[PDB]
Amino acid sequence: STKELTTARIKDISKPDENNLQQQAPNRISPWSKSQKPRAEAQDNVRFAVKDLAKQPRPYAAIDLIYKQPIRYIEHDNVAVCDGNGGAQGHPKVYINLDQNKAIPCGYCGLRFAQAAFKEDIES
Amino acid sequence: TDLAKELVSGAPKELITERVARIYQETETWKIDWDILNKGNRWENDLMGYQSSSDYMQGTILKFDTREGAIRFAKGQGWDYYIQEP
Amino acid sequence: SSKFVFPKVVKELRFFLSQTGEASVPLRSFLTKTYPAIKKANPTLPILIREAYGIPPSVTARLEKGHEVKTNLEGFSADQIAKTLQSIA
Amino acid sequence: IPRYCYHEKLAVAGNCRMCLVASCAMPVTPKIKKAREGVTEMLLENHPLDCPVCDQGGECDLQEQSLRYGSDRGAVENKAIGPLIKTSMNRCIHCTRCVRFLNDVAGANSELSANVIDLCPVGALTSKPYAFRARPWELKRTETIDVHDALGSNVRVDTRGIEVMRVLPRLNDEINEEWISDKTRFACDGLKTQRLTKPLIRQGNTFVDATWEEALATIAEGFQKVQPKENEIKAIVGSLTDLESIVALKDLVNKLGSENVSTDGDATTVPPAHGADFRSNYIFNSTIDNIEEADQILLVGTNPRHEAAVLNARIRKVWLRSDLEVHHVGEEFDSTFELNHLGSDVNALAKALTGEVGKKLSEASKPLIIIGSGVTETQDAEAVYATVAKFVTSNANIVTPEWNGFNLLHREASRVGALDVGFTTQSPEVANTKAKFIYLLGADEIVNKDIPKDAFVVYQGHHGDLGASFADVILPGSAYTEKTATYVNTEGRVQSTRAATNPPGVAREDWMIIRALSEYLGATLPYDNLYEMRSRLADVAPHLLRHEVVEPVSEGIAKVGFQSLVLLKNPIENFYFTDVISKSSPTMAKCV
Amino acid sequence: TNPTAFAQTTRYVKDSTEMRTLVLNLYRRYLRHSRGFVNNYNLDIPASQVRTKIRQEFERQRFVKDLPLKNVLYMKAQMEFQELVNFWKQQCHVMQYFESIKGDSFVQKFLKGAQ
Ligand code: SF4
Ligand code: SF4
Ligand code: FES
Ligand SMILES: [K+]
Ligand SMILES: [Zn+2]
To answer: What are the alphabetically sorted keywords of the record (chain E) (predicted)?
Structure first.
């Protein structure tokens, strides 16, 4: 189709086949940033003429992995505290306001926090 | 004052014949930089996307404490320069 | 009126003078007092007057095919300035 | 002397307490050092640890004054105010600089509302298109001018290599005064889309890539085919066209025995109602700085909200510090300052000159009259430009040795520069002639100008738009950020853009294109470099080689120019779409 | 210590007549050692061409007026001579020295992007 391989989208429209070497990542088909060069166009070069594409470095896309984590829910509070879940080996500690009726991701980790009283609306 | 110190400096002739310098007060010192090349100032490297260049004066920025020093030095090197009035 | 009906080969005139001094006054007096007569005789001819501090007076005559002949009028008399315009043709 | 809440362009505040000796509000040592440390810790008590992910990182006033005047040891939800300002109020230090600008200068959703990003000293308010893309130490700073409006506001262009990152205002107390419009700063992303990078040759209903040697040869085979006679060679100049290219195109058509040169405007009267014969007839003779000392200003067929937003803020500033009264004639509009509306035509303007407005203007120490750029495109331009001129000449205060009270306000930068080099035909005999060879020097306002079906049309420009579609051969040009060009604003000041980046693809400098085309068409111009090109500029107007200098018109000569002159719709239908660079902007589409 | 072979002590000459004689003496030394340059550096040109190249470099600075520039030019010309005779320069540098050398029109440069 060449459209899911060369365009940046929020979510993939089809199932990622990890044996397809034209995908941007083994778990994601389309690029996850507007300036990111599509992997299909990158490998269409003179330097890839006689190389094995399967052995080239293909890390999994972080955008697909971070959103499979469940939304954290806070009980009896309006502020979520995150410090990378590692302390001195995590990220700087930040406080996340939960006033709105939505899941607000962490500025470093990407973990999406929410209030438990807003659980049903967000799951919808 | 009027000595052609460019004859014994060792710099190539293009600084005198082709390149043009700018004298400006950017907010307490006077600086001298060179106008970019029309072509060859930058071009994307096809391998890793690095910013290539053939301008060897691109990163050179002289500093002066007075406006008189900047003009006197530029004349002493025979440089083609224009003063950007503050 | 007079000889101020410029020929068709004459396409543009530009007058240069200064806001101050004493050399531009003869051209300043010439153009200020005579402009309506020239524009009346040459309704479509573009008469351009441009000033700059300290430049000497002159007239530029843009003839056919982009040809330009510039006459310097540094300190000339108003009567001779009128003669000079008559001699542009 | 550290500060967070002090800025002389705004009102005085004492809610930051960093200027203790509050010296900002107060008119005219270890305790002070201890005091500065104590105040600094209070701001950092609640501040979030966001510096790595915060756009103010290398240019943060809170960081620098924590380092300089503090010790080294020690949750508010966000809001939405538009797609242009990214708000993270956790970082706000509660300094009220946003409130003073949004209510006193802006008058607000505004054309100046994006300037609050500059005033916010911390990362509470940051540019949204610029978010996460660059650090201030990566950027090369280039001092140039704006061409999105006729003001010529002095902007600072920050480039990271080839790319242009952001546009920031730079100080100039004569034109813009530290402010730029949202168009002036958020249209830079149009320079990366729809760009003309390759010569394109039209073969049927398609365009194909071409070399410069061919694209300048197809024109020659196109110029020798249609064979335009004397006044059948039509050359058109658009809004964003530099002066070095207007003069080159003017001389090229002349060497082909032609004078049919014009702009992209739709002025019905072929000689513009102001006339290009005298400079004083079409410039801001009072100069932008002297708008401060205004007593009575007459706005004639102009909308400063859209025609020139930065200058519009100057009017509001005087309206607050004094008792200025501004009388406006024409179509009504929402205004940031009080206006006494008179009428929507020229009958009211003449009647206003016979009413209380004329009496105030007669006895005003420094009167002002402002005529819009769209007035010349309206039918009653002859009526206005004679009604006002007769009023100007009949009275004394309007034209004095110390004060000149007539000003024409344009909207497109290339206008005044074209007029000074005499790039406007002064005859309807030349203008009405049919065209066979058409050269669109960056002109895209052709929805109203005739284009014959058999005419050979060449588009030279830096963007692909409607004007490029009509072309038979497309020549790529360089945008203003890429060329060392010359622009003259509405007040007659010569300002030169400084080249920050190279043009993209195989695009060339705009005037070098015309000179090269001359050698192919037997009209070889004598120009060989920019210095020789700029020497020619002094041969068309002596003042053009005087950068940043206004050459005031002599009082005596300007009087004759005023004398010889003897529905006002707003010209702009959409603010976000004025020039080609704004149309390609994705950010401006979000504003729409 | 002792100076290397063909070394001259640096002196600031204050007399244009005395400077002129020193330049002419050095010019003769370049001509005399021209056959040596062809031998040591294995050049592909006759010594006659080498002497012609020497004269061109001396003719470039023929009309230098300022005395302070003459001394620096003379001092640098002596250093180069001591470099060539003692075979300190590598043969590649001397070969490229003789590798040195119609300008295109406006359109020709315009087509290729100019300079
Ligand atoms: S506003 Fe300044 S101190 Fe606060 S997070 Fe941003 S860079 Fe750090
Ligand atoms: S948002 Fe910015 S400008 Fe407004 S008060 Fe807070 S720090 Fe000051
Ligand atoms: S600068 Fe004076 S208290 Fe803020
Ligand atoms: K800010
Ligand atoms: Zn986190």
So the answer is: Electron transport, Membrane, Mitochondrion, Mitochondrion inner membrane, Oxidoreductase, Respiratory chain, Transport, Ubiquinone
